[PDB]
Design a protein around this ligand. Structure first.
Ligand SMILES: Nc1ncnc2c1ncn2[C@@H]1O[C@H](COP(=O)(O)OP(=O)(O)NP(=O)(O)O)[C@@H](O)[C@H]1O
Ligand SMILES: [Mg+2]
Length: 358
Protein backbone atom coordinates (compact mmCIF):
# COMPACT_ATOMS: atom_id res chain seq x y z
CA UNK A 1 0.00 0.00 0.00
CA UNK A 2 0.93 3.69 -0.30
CA UNK A 3 2.17 3.22 -3.86
CA UNK A 4 1.26 4.82 -7.18
CA UNK A 5 1.06 2.43 -10.12
CA UNK A 6 1.14 4.00 -13.56
CA UNK A 7 2.41 3.90 -17.11
CA UNK A 8 4.10 7.03 -18.41
CA UNK A 9 4.06 8.14 -22.03
CA UNK A 10 5.96 11.36 -22.71
CA UNK A 11 6.53 13.42 -25.84
CA UNK A 12 6.90 16.97 -27.13
CA UNK A 13 3.14 17.49 -27.12
CA UNK A 14 1.84 15.92 -23.92
CA UNK A 15 2.91 13.89 -20.92
CA UNK A 16 0.42 11.03 -20.79
CA UNK A 17 -0.28 8.96 -17.68
CA UNK A 18 -2.43 5.91 -17.07
CA UNK A 19 -2.70 4.83 -13.44
CA UNK A 20 -4.80 2.71 -11.10
CA UNK A 21 -7.29 4.60 -8.97
CA UNK A 22 -8.85 3.58 -5.66
CA UNK A 23 -11.46 1.34 -7.30
CA UNK A 24 -8.72 -0.49 -9.20
CA UNK A 25 -9.58 0.89 -12.63
CA UNK A 26 -7.44 2.68 -15.20
CA UNK A 27 -7.60 6.46 -15.08
CA UNK A 28 -5.83 8.57 -17.70
CA UNK A 29 -4.96 12.21 -18.32
CA UNK A 30 -2.36 14.31 -20.14
CA UNK A 31 -0.35 17.32 -19.04
CA UNK A 32 0.83 19.53 -21.94
CA UNK A 33 4.63 19.66 -22.14
CA UNK A 34 4.84 23.36 -21.23
CA UNK A 35 6.32 25.08 -18.17
CA UNK A 36 6.91 28.60 -16.88
CA UNK A 37 8.61 30.09 -13.84
CA UNK A 38 6.07 31.13 -11.23
CA UNK A 39 6.12 33.24 -8.05
CA UNK A 40 6.74 31.39 -4.75
CA UNK A 41 3.00 31.76 -4.06
CA UNK A 42 -0.55 32.23 -5.36
CA UNK A 43 -1.95 35.18 -7.33
CA UNK A 44 -13.21 15.67 -16.36
CA UNK A 45 -9.57 16.63 -15.76
CA UNK A 46 -10.63 19.68 -13.72
CA UNK A 47 -7.58 19.48 -11.47
CA UNK A 48 -4.99 20.06 -14.22
CA UNK A 49 -6.64 23.21 -15.57
CA UNK A 50 -4.58 25.25 -13.13
CA UNK A 51 -1.23 23.85 -12.01
CA UNK A 52 0.97 26.06 -9.84
CA UNK A 53 3.42 23.80 -8.04
CA UNK A 54 6.57 23.92 -5.94
CA UNK A 55 8.85 21.08 -6.95
CA UNK A 56 11.74 19.91 -4.78
CA UNK A 57 13.89 17.32 -6.54
CA UNK A 58 17.57 16.57 -7.07
CA UNK A 59 16.89 15.58 -10.67
CA UNK A 60 16.59 19.33 -11.19
CA UNK A 61 19.60 21.67 -11.27
CA UNK A 62 20.55 25.34 -11.09
CA UNK A 63 17.69 27.72 -10.43
CA UNK A 64 15.22 24.88 -11.03
CA UNK A 65 16.53 23.24 -7.83
CA UNK A 66 13.48 24.01 -5.66
CA UNK A 67 11.32 26.83 -7.01
CA UNK A 68 7.77 27.20 -8.34
CA UNK A 69 6.26 26.55 -11.77
CA UNK A 70 3.14 26.89 -13.84
CA UNK A 71 2.70 23.47 -15.44
CA UNK A 72 0.68 22.36 -18.46
CA UNK A 73 -2.43 24.28 -19.52
CA UNK A 74 -1.95 27.14 -17.06
CA UNK A 75 1.57 27.53 -18.46
CA UNK A 76 0.62 27.77 -22.14
CA UNK A 77 -0.77 31.28 -21.61
CA UNK A 78 2.28 32.77 -19.86
CA UNK A 79 4.66 35.12 -21.71
CA UNK A 80 7.91 33.47 -20.71
CA UNK A 81 6.62 29.94 -20.97
CA UNK A 82 9.07 27.26 -22.06
CA UNK A 83 8.37 24.67 -24.74
CA UNK A 84 10.41 22.00 -26.58
CA UNK A 85 12.68 23.78 -29.04
CA UNK A 86 12.66 22.21 -32.51
CA UNK A 87 14.71 23.35 -35.49
CA UNK A 88 13.81 23.67 -39.17
CA UNK A 89 14.38 19.96 -39.80
CA UNK A 90 19.55 17.05 -21.85
CA UNK A 91 19.46 20.41 -20.08
CA UNK A 92 15.89 20.80 -21.24
CA UNK A 93 15.21 17.99 -18.79
CA UNK A 94 13.01 20.12 -16.51
CA UNK A 95 10.73 20.58 -19.50
CA UNK A 96 10.03 16.84 -19.30
CA UNK A 97 10.68 16.05 -15.63
CA UNK A 98 8.35 18.75 -14.30
CA UNK A 99 5.23 17.77 -16.24
CA UNK A 100 6.19 14.18 -15.38
CA UNK A 101 6.43 14.65 -11.60
CA UNK A 102 3.37 16.91 -11.74
CA UNK A 103 1.33 14.09 -13.28
CA UNK A 104 2.49 11.69 -10.56
CA UNK A 105 1.40 14.23 -7.95
CA UNK A 106 -2.02 14.84 -9.49
CA UNK A 107 -2.71 11.10 -9.59
CA UNK A 108 -1.48 10.88 -5.99
CA UNK A 109 -3.86 13.64 -4.92
CA UNK A 110 -6.68 12.03 -6.93
CA UNK A 111 -6.39 8.81 -4.93
CA UNK A 112 -5.80 10.54 -1.61
CA UNK A 113 -2.24 9.47 -0.90
CA UNK A 114 0.41 11.96 0.23
CA UNK A 115 3.40 9.62 0.12
CA UNK A 116 3.83 7.37 -2.90
CA UNK A 117 6.56 5.16 -4.27
CA UNK A 118 6.26 5.19 -8.05
CA UNK A 119 7.90 2.25 -9.83
CA UNK A 120 8.60 3.80 -13.20
CA UNK A 121 7.10 2.19 -16.27
CA UNK A 122 7.67 4.23 -19.41
CA UNK A 123 9.24 4.37 -22.83
CA UNK A 124 11.92 5.99 -24.96
CA UNK A 125 11.98 6.66 -28.70
CA UNK A 126 14.94 5.26 -30.71
CA UNK A 127 20.56 4.42 -23.04
CA UNK A 128 17.80 2.99 -20.85
CA UNK A 129 19.80 2.75 -17.63
CA UNK A 130 21.12 6.30 -17.91
CA UNK A 131 17.72 7.88 -18.60
CA UNK A 132 16.14 6.07 -15.63
CA UNK A 133 18.70 7.54 -13.24
CA UNK A 134 17.52 11.07 -13.97
CA UNK A 135 14.32 9.84 -12.33
CA UNK A 136 15.48 7.96 -9.24
CA UNK A 137 15.31 9.62 -5.84
CA UNK A 138 12.77 11.63 -3.90
CA UNK A 139 10.59 14.36 -5.37
CA UNK A 140 8.17 16.63 -3.56
CA UNK A 141 5.34 18.44 -5.32
CA UNK A 142 3.34 21.07 -3.44
CA UNK A 143 0.29 22.69 -5.02
CA UNK A 144 0.17 26.46 -4.54
CA UNK A 145 -3.16 26.99 -6.27
CA UNK A 146 -6.02 25.04 -7.85
CA UNK A 147 -7.93 21.93 -6.75
CA UNK A 148 -5.24 20.57 -4.43
CA UNK A 149 -3.91 23.87 -3.06
CA UNK A 150 -1.96 23.16 0.12
CA UNK A 151 -1.33 19.50 -0.67
CA UNK A 152 2.19 18.07 -0.49
CA UNK A 153 3.04 14.80 -2.25
CA UNK A 154 6.25 12.81 -1.75
CA UNK A 155 7.25 10.83 -4.83
CA UNK A 156 9.82 8.07 -4.42
CA UNK A 157 11.23 6.34 -7.50
CA UNK A 158 13.46 3.37 -6.68
CA UNK A 159 12.85 1.04 -9.61
CA UNK A 160 12.01 1.59 -13.26
CA UNK A 161 11.70 0.11 -16.74
CA UNK A 162 11.50 1.51 -20.26
CA UNK A 163 9.67 -1.54 -21.64
CA UNK A 164 12.09 -1.85 -24.56
CA UNK A 165 11.61 -5.52 -25.43
CA UNK A 166 8.79 -8.04 -25.66
CA UNK A 167 5.04 -7.55 -25.66
CA UNK A 168 5.15 -4.75 -23.06
CA UNK A 169 4.47 -1.88 -25.48
CA UNK A 170 1.49 -3.82 -26.87
CA UNK A 171 -0.32 -5.14 -23.79
CA UNK A 172 -3.25 -2.70 -24.05
CA UNK A 173 -4.32 -4.38 -27.30
CA UNK A 174 -5.23 -7.58 -25.46
CA UNK A 175 -5.83 -6.56 -21.85
CA UNK A 176 -7.65 -4.11 -19.57
CA UNK A 177 -7.62 -3.48 -15.81
CA UNK A 178 -11.04 -3.39 -14.11
CA UNK A 179 -10.14 -3.81 -10.42
CA UNK A 180 -7.51 -5.95 -12.15
CA UNK A 181 -6.95 -7.65 -14.43
CA UNK A 182 -8.87 -8.97 -17.39
CA UNK A 183 -9.00 -9.88 -21.10
CA UNK A 184 -10.42 -7.42 -23.65
CA UNK A 185 -13.92 -7.85 -25.10
CA UNK A 186 1.25 -12.79 -34.07
CA UNK A 187 4.99 -13.30 -33.65
CA UNK A 188 5.92 -10.51 -36.05
CA UNK A 189 4.12 -7.18 -35.84
CA UNK A 190 4.33 -3.42 -36.23
CA UNK A 191 3.00 -0.89 -33.73
CA UNK A 192 1.96 2.43 -35.18
CA UNK A 193 1.25 5.03 -32.51
CA UNK A 194 -0.46 7.90 -34.32
CA UNK A 195 0.15 11.10 -32.38
CA UNK A 196 -0.32 14.87 -32.51
CA UNK A 197 3.05 16.02 -33.84
CA UNK A 198 4.64 12.67 -34.61
CA UNK A 199 3.88 9.13 -35.76
CA UNK A 200 5.80 6.24 -34.23
CA UNK A 201 6.36 3.23 -36.45
CA UNK A 202 7.88 0.43 -34.36
CA UNK A 203 8.43 -3.14 -35.54
CA UNK A 204 8.71 -6.15 -33.25
CA UNK A 205 10.21 -9.40 -34.49
CA UNK A 206 10.90 -12.60 -32.53
CA UNK A 207 10.24 -11.01 -29.13
CA UNK A 208 12.62 -8.14 -29.85
CA UNK A 209 12.22 -4.56 -31.02
CA UNK A 210 13.72 -4.30 -34.50
CA UNK A 211 15.93 -1.33 -33.66
CA UNK A 212 16.87 -0.57 -37.26
CA UNK A 213 13.54 -0.60 -39.11
CA UNK A 214 11.58 0.85 -36.19
CA UNK A 215 11.24 4.42 -37.40
CA UNK A 216 9.60 7.68 -36.32
CA UNK A 217 8.09 10.43 -38.47
CA UNK A 218 6.35 13.76 -37.91
CA UNK A 219 3.17 12.49 -39.56
CA UNK A 220 1.00 13.98 -36.83
CA UNK A 221 -2.62 15.09 -36.68
CA UNK A 222 -1.60 18.67 -35.87
CA UNK A 223 -0.73 19.91 -39.37
CA UNK A 224 -4.06 18.56 -40.63
CA UNK A 225 -5.89 20.21 -37.74
CA UNK A 226 -4.16 23.52 -38.49
CA UNK A 227 -5.34 23.19 -42.09
CA UNK A 228 -8.94 22.58 -41.00
CA UNK A 229 -8.85 25.56 -38.64
CA UNK A 230 -7.44 27.79 -41.38
CA UNK A 231 -10.28 26.75 -43.69
CA UNK A 232 -12.94 27.29 -41.02
CA UNK A 233 -11.74 30.79 -40.17
CA UNK A 234 -11.77 31.59 -43.89
CA UNK A 235 -15.33 30.27 -44.31
CA UNK A 236 -16.51 32.99 -41.93
CA UNK A 237 -14.63 35.87 -43.57
CA UNK A 238 -13.15 30.34 -32.46
CA UNK A 239 -10.93 27.81 -30.74
CA UNK A 240 -8.09 28.62 -28.42
CA UNK A 241 -5.93 25.51 -28.74
CA UNK A 242 -6.05 22.38 -30.90
CA UNK A 243 -7.18 20.26 -27.96
CA UNK A 244 -10.10 22.65 -27.58
CA UNK A 245 -11.01 22.07 -31.23
CA UNK A 246 -10.72 18.32 -30.78
CA UNK A 247 -12.55 18.14 -27.46
CA UNK A 248 -15.41 20.54 -28.16
CA UNK A 249 -16.07 19.96 -31.86
CA UNK A 250 -14.48 16.67 -32.90
CA UNK A 251 -14.67 14.21 -29.97
CA UNK A 252 -18.48 14.16 -29.50
CA UNK A 253 -19.01 13.36 -33.19
CA UNK A 254 -16.16 10.86 -33.56
CA UNK A 255 -17.88 9.07 -30.68
CA UNK A 256 -21.35 8.72 -32.21
CA UNK A 257 -19.61 7.27 -35.26
CA UNK A 258 -17.93 4.66 -33.06
CA UNK A 259 -21.19 3.43 -31.54
CA UNK A 260 -23.11 3.62 -34.83
CA UNK A 261 -21.54 2.91 -38.22
CA UNK A 262 -24.49 4.51 -40.01
CA UNK A 263 -24.24 7.87 -38.24
CA UNK A 264 -23.19 10.86 -40.33
CA UNK A 265 -21.28 13.49 -38.34
CA UNK A 266 -22.12 17.21 -38.33
CA UNK A 267 -19.56 19.89 -37.53
CA UNK A 268 -20.82 23.41 -36.92
CA UNK A 269 -18.96 26.41 -35.52
CA UNK A 270 -20.45 29.38 -33.68
CA UNK A 271 -18.12 32.36 -34.05
CA UNK A 272 -19.53 35.78 -33.21
CA UNK A 273 -23.03 36.46 -34.56
CA UNK A 274 -22.43 33.79 -37.22
CA UNK A 275 -22.85 30.01 -37.13
CA UNK A 276 -21.48 27.93 -40.01
CA UNK A 277 -21.83 24.31 -41.07
CA UNK A 278 -18.24 23.23 -41.67
CA UNK A 279 -18.86 19.48 -41.84
CA UNK A 280 -17.35 19.36 -45.33
CA UNK A 281 -14.24 21.23 -44.19
CA UNK A 282 -13.59 19.02 -41.17
CA UNK A 283 -14.24 15.69 -42.92
CA UNK A 284 -11.84 16.75 -45.68
CA UNK A 285 -8.92 17.12 -43.28
CA UNK A 286 -9.94 13.87 -41.62
CA UNK A 287 -9.87 11.75 -44.79
CA UNK A 288 -6.74 13.53 -46.03
CA UNK A 289 -5.08 12.43 -42.80
CA UNK A 290 -6.65 8.98 -43.08
CA UNK A 291 -5.41 8.34 -46.63
CA UNK A 292 -1.98 9.83 -45.89
CA UNK A 293 -1.76 7.46 -42.93
CA UNK A 294 -3.17 4.55 -44.96
CA UNK A 295 -0.33 5.14 -47.42
CA UNK A 296 2.34 5.44 -44.72
CA UNK A 297 1.17 2.28 -42.96
CA UNK A 298 1.14 0.36 -46.25
CA UNK A 299 4.81 0.93 -47.05
CA UNK A 300 5.95 0.27 -43.48
CA UNK A 301 3.97 -2.95 -43.70
CA UNK A 302 5.87 -3.78 -46.90
CA UNK A 303 9.22 -2.61 -45.50
CA UNK A 304 8.91 -4.83 -42.43
CA UNK A 305 6.58 -7.44 -43.93
CA UNK A 306 5.03 -7.77 -40.48
CA UNK A 307 2.44 -10.51 -40.02
CA UNK A 308 0.07 -7.99 -38.43
CA UNK A 309 -0.05 -4.19 -38.13
CA UNK A 310 -1.43 -2.57 -34.98
CA UNK A 311 -2.59 1.04 -35.31
CA UNK A 312 -3.08 3.05 -32.12
CA UNK A 313 -2.96 6.61 -30.80
CA UNK A 314 -5.39 9.52 -30.97
CA UNK A 315 -4.89 9.65 -34.73
CA UNK A 316 -7.02 6.53 -34.94
CA UNK A 317 -9.78 8.70 -33.49
CA UNK A 318 -9.17 11.97 -35.36
CA UNK A 319 -9.04 10.07 -38.64
CA UNK A 320 -11.60 7.47 -37.56
CA UNK A 321 -13.93 8.33 -40.45
CA UNK A 322 -11.31 6.86 -42.77
CA UNK A 323 -9.17 4.65 -40.52
CA UNK A 324 -12.10 2.46 -39.43
CA UNK A 325 -11.65 0.77 -42.81
CA UNK A 326 -8.63 -0.97 -41.28
CA UNK A 327 -11.08 -3.05 -39.25
CA UNK A 328 -12.18 -4.80 -42.45
CA UNK A 329 -8.58 -5.49 -43.51
CA UNK A 330 -6.72 -8.60 -42.45
CA UNK A 331 -3.20 -7.58 -41.44
CA UNK A 332 -4.35 -4.52 -39.50
CA UNK A 333 -5.49 -4.48 -35.88
CA UNK A 334 -7.32 -1.61 -34.19
CA UNK A 335 -7.98 -1.62 -30.43
CA UNK A 336 -11.28 -3.33 -29.59
CA UNK A 337 -11.90 -0.73 -26.89
CA UNK A 338 -11.10 1.86 -29.55
CA UNK A 339 -12.15 4.86 -27.44
CA UNK A 340 -8.97 4.34 -25.41
CA UNK A 341 -6.68 4.36 -28.46
CA UNK A 342 -5.11 7.70 -27.49
CA UNK A 343 -3.71 6.30 -24.24
CA UNK A 344 -2.81 2.91 -25.72
CA UNK A 345 0.89 3.19 -24.91
CA UNK A 346 0.54 4.56 -21.37
CA UNK A 347 -2.16 1.95 -20.73
CA UNK A 348 0.25 -0.67 -22.10
CA UNK A 349 3.00 0.59 -19.80
CA UNK A 350 0.59 0.45 -16.87
CA UNK A 351 -0.27 -3.18 -17.59
CA UNK A 352 3.42 -4.04 -17.94
CA UNK A 353 3.98 -2.46 -14.54
CA UNK A 354 1.19 -4.27 -12.69
CA UNK A 355 2.66 -7.53 -13.99
CA UNK A 356 6.11 -6.44 -12.79
CA UNK A 357 4.65 -6.17 -9.29
CA UNK A 358 3.68 -9.85 -9.46
N1 LIG B 1 -11.67 10.91 -29.25
C1 LIG B 1 -10.93 11.61 -30.11
N2 LIG B 1 -11.51 12.04 -31.26
C2 LIG B 1 -10.77 12.74 -32.13
N3 LIG B 1 -9.49 13.09 -32.05
C3 LIG B 1 -8.94 12.64 -30.91
C4 LIG B 1 -9.56 11.92 -29.91
N4 LIG B 1 -8.69 11.63 -28.88
C5 LIG B 1 -7.56 12.18 -29.27
N5 LIG B 1 -7.64 12.81 -30.49
C6 LIG B 1 -6.58 13.52 -31.19
O1 LIG B 1 -5.68 12.59 -31.75
C7 LIG B 1 -4.39 13.23 -31.90
C8 LIG B 1 -3.30 12.34 -31.35
O2 LIG B 1 -3.40 12.27 -29.91
P1 LIG B 1 -2.21 11.65 -29.08
O3 LIG B 1 -1.73 10.33 -29.68
O4 LIG B 1 -2.64 11.55 -27.66
O5 LIG B 1 -1.04 12.71 -29.28
P2 LIG B 1 0.29 12.68 -28.47
O6 LIG B 1 0.74 11.26 -28.28
O7 LIG B 1 0.09 13.34 -27.07
N6 LIG B 1 1.45 13.55 -29.31
P3 LIG B 1 2.72 12.57 -29.84
O8 LIG B 1 3.93 12.71 -28.83
O9 LIG B 1 3.17 13.00 -31.20
O10 LIG B 1 2.26 11.06 -29.89
C9 LIG B 1 -4.51 14.61 -31.24
O11 LIG B 1 -4.76 15.60 -32.23
C10 LIG B 1 -5.73 14.43 -30.32
O12 LIG B 1 -6.39 15.66 -30.03
MG1 LIG C 1 2.34 9.31 -28.01
Amino acid sequence: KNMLLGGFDTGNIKAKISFLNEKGNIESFAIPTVIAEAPPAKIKDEDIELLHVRIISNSLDGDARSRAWYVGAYAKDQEDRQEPTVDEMQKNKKLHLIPLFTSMAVAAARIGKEEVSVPFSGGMPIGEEQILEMLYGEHTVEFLDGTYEGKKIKITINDGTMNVEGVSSVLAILFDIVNGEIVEVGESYAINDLGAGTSDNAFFEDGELNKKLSTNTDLGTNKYIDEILKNIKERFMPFKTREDFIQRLVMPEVEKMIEDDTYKPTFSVKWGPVKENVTDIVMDGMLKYAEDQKASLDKFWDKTNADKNIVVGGGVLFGYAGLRDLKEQDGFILPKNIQESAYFTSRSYLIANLLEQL
